[PDB]
Amino acid sequence: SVKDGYAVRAADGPGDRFIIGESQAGEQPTQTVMPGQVMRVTTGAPIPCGADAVVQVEDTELIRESDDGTEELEVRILVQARPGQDI
């Protein structure tokens, strides 16, 4: 919530995962999430309604994207987290 970055599932584990979610600081409505997916988390953001932990944007990765930066659709993650880190 407080720190920016991404919000990942609990029992998933590190690996390649798709990107479908954007988050706004002052917009609570969000769509549902499915296993093997992540949500882009900005500083001071609501819970994405289906996550349990938030990973730092530093411990991330990039993938090939569109010519006009139209999303990457892949993030990947590095280390294993613990369910519940932000209130």
Next chain:
Amino acid sequence: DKAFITVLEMTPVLGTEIINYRDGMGRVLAQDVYAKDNLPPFPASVKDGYAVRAADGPGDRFIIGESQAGEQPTQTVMPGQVMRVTTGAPIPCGADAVVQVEDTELIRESDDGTEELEVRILVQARPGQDIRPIGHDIKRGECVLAKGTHMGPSEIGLLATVGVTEVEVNKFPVVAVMSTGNELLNPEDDLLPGKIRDSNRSTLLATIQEHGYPTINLGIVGDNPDDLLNALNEGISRADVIITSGGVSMGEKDYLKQVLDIDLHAQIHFGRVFMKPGLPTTFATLDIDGVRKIIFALPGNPVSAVVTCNLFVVPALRKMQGILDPRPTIIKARLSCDVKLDPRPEYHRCILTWHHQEPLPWAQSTGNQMSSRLMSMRSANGLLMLPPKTEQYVELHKGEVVDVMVIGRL
């Protein structure tokens, strides 16, 4: 041995087609099969029991739902709840798997029917105990099945899990068989003066059908040097390998060689192998329109026909499709009956056995020729290779080591 190298130096390699995953036990594949989704596509459990958030002691208070066989959309934000996962089911919002309720001291106030309140499991487990993560077996993009191989029985199962119904494999040859000699009648008729029924057609056709290749039967063509041209011309049109039995052993009137040479204009690579009485072994190739075709001319004795068409004919149709190392398998066994040694070497058809006491298998001869008064119930399962006569060594006793071939299931 020069025949074997020559045989595997002119046979081409066929094209490719597209087939379903049901048919295709044995075909070698030509493309590369890639995965499209993970396996499993969601975290699951291996045991059945309770799923509890980590960083907790023996303190739990409530159970909300339980497993099933879909995706369960329910979880409270509180950290003192349990979900009771079964043998195979997603893990909703936790990190610790089945706590082995059958092993720990569990159960609480519960309900009159089928419900529970709490567990209070004293033991604690590491974060991640029995969960199977996403991709523990197959990743999103991976080679799984490579080009080459042979498409065994368990290989079709791997194709189903990935989800590729259509593949690209090599084709099978079409083989046609004909028999020669103007002294043979079909084995469905009463005998006439001075004639013998022909058996080489049936024995050969039942040998190239065990592997699975399609077959076409031509008939019995006369030994005249005229009707052979009218017969081989039909065979060369609707097939790729034509096999002829007997003949050749005439010399002055060896019509088969004449018909092949001054007519179809086909190359004759070799005309005889170094063997004791029994000449006919002719390899030929013909090139029409660009697709090369193979012809053979097997000997006439009923016992030498199987040996010839299992030593350098059977290991030549295999290279035609996809096999990387087409070579017959030679094992080592022991003898169980004294056999005489003639000067030039021969080949005996035998039967193998396996006793669970001593390593090497045991071999029993089943008659060099004639083949009457069959003993034992099991059918022949290979050929036996013998050495030629050498001074004092003119007789082989029981035991020792001999070289045995494999021609069928064992």
Next chain:
Amino acid sequence: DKAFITVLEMTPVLGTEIINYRDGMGRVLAQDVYAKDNLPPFPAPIGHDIKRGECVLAKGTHMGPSEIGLLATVGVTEVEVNKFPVVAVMSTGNELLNPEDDLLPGKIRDSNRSTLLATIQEHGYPTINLGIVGDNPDDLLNALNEGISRADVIITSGGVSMGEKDYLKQVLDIDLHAQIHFGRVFMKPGLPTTFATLDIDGVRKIIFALPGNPVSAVVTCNLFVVPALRKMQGILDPRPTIIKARLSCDVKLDPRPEYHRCILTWHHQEPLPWAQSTGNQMSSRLMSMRSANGLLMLPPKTEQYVELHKGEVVDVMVIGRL
């Protein structure tokens, strides 16, 4: 071990039929064949290979490609042989989809089917495919009735868990009355399997139940089911084959023994061969471009058998062409 004894002591033997010689590869014989005319019927002696009115091949010996040769030399076009079984296979589990379909939440693809069918269809027997059957008791009842109404042996894969509310055991002793012989046999606790016998106004029928793990399914089929269809054919000895070999690599062992898939090789320099394992459940193997030929039997983890080396000699069961 006692599991194998029970299966061979309750499987029946089918009848007989008349067929042609051409379509007769792999069938055991019922009658006896006698010569009709001497061979050769003229001096080359008058009769040197076959004497007239002498037994050629006996009753109850397996027919091979070489033995079909004699059947045409004498002239007996038609013989009497035992009949082949009909096997129908079904797969349970409410988490399965046909392999020719996309992915929905929490669903995987059928794998044990199309693996059992291919293995049986390799030996020569016909088959009938049923589909995926749910765990509703009404649905399970309908599926089994069709199976016993068009075939003789029924093989079911999956749905052996939930022993408290096992639906398979319920329909086998309430609706369709039948006797269950064994339900969990593996020496020390192993994967479940059930053998059942049902008899209805005549011929007996056998119904099988096999686990859901894709690696242990093939071990069960080639050790119990395969050496039981062959007795129905008429083969005198339906035992499998065991040979001795060395090890291609050194592998760790675990308390309870398990079975692995191995590829058999041979060399021209040493007598005994050695085999290389491929693992129970892994991401296949980039190398070893050959299909499996046997099943390695790892011994139980003893003090001396904590682990094995490349020089140890083991046993293996041939399950394919070598």
